[PDB]
Amino acid sequence: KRSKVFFDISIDNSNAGRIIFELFSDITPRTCENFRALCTGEKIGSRGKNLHYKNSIFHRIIPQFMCQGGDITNGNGSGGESIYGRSFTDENFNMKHDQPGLLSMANAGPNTNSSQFLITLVPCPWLDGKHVVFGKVIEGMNVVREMEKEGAKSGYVKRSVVITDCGEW
C-alpha cells in the first residue's frame, strides 16, 4: 500500500545526491497522497501553475534538529498550498518523531497543513501530537546530512539548497 518518491538535491547548482522516501500511505493516506501529488506536479494550484516541489528550496535548516522546505508559493516559510486547498486537517498522530530521517508536516497550529514539511535529523518527541509524521528516508540519509551542513543555529541557510527534480520512484 505504501508508495515511494524521490528528491534530487542541488547546493548552489551542484548536485548533492538523491533522497528516496517511503510514504506511510497505510496510516495517513490523505497526507501521503498530498505529498505524492506534489512530487509529480500533477495538480493545478489556486493560481494557474501546477503544485510542484520541483525548484522549491529548503528555507530553514537547523543542525541537530531538522531540514524544512516545501514553501512552494513564497519560499520563505509563510506560504504553501495543498491539493486539498490552502490547508487541511491533521489526519492522525499515530506515528511519532522517534528517529532521524522522518518526514513530518510543518504547520501553524491545529489543522493547518499545506505543503511545508520537515525531515528530522534526530528524534523530536516534543513535536509528537502536534505534527503529522507521514514518511521515512529509506535512501540518501547521507545526502540529508550534507544538507544539514548548510544550515545554522538560527535556521538561516546561506547557500541555495534546491530540489532540482522529483517524482515517484
Partner: peptide
C-alpha cells in the same frame, strides 16, 4: 525553542 512552524517562528 525548537519548533517547525509556517509564518510565526517561535522560541
Amino acid at each position: 525553542x525548537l519548533l517547525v512552524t509556517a509564518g510565526l517562528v517561535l522560541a
